[PDB]
Amino acid sequence: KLHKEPATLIKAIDGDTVKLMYKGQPMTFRLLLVDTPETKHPKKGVEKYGPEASAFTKKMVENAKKLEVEFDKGQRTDKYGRGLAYIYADGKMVNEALVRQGLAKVAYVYKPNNTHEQHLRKSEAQAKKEKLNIWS
């Protein structure tokens, strides 16, 4: 049974990456299951909707009363040392909000870290049917 834990914002880094204080430690978190356009992409650089995805994640985590992290059932860190998690801002999952807005795609998924996969895929279908941002 997945469970949420509190965390405190340190800095938003990108649409898909946020630095948080978690159980007393500064940690970088990668948002599970979503690919956003990046402002800091390894090769391309500042892609299209990158600033926008990045501004959405920032406003959302910066304006929250409560932030919570939710680890999935598999590995909890990636090869870069980043936490792998669903992030919640006052009860609303940031990963889903990005996708619902057409500001992220559902990433390639790796079992068993796929608990909220269907939910996300349903919001992605909606944003595409509404032709939002990425999908217009």
Domain spans in the chain, listed from the N-terminal domain onward = 1-136
10 close to 27: Cβ distance less than 8 angstroms = no
Q: What is the DSSP secondary structure assignment for residue 36, as one 8-state letter?
A: -
Facing residues of 82 across strands?
none
Q: Of the residues 38, 52, 96, 124, which is catalytic?
A: 38
- d(CA 96, CA 100) in angstroms, rounded, equals 6
* Region of residue 98 (left: phi > 0; alpha: psi -120 to 50; beta: else): alpha
Q: Of the residues 70, 76, 82, 121, which is catalytic?
A: 82
Experimentally, the structure was elucidated by: X-ray
Is 100 one of the catalytic residues? no
- d(CA 36, CA 95) in angstroms, rounded, equals 10
1: Cβ–Cβ under 8 A, 6 or more apart, which residues?
A: none
Q: Of the residues 30, 52, 68, 124, which is catalytic?
A: 30
Domain 1-136's class? mainly beta
Report the Cα–Cα distance between both ends of the chain, in Å, rounded.
37
Is 76 one of the catalytic residues? no
Is 38 one of the catalytic residues? yes
36 marked among binding-site residues:
yes
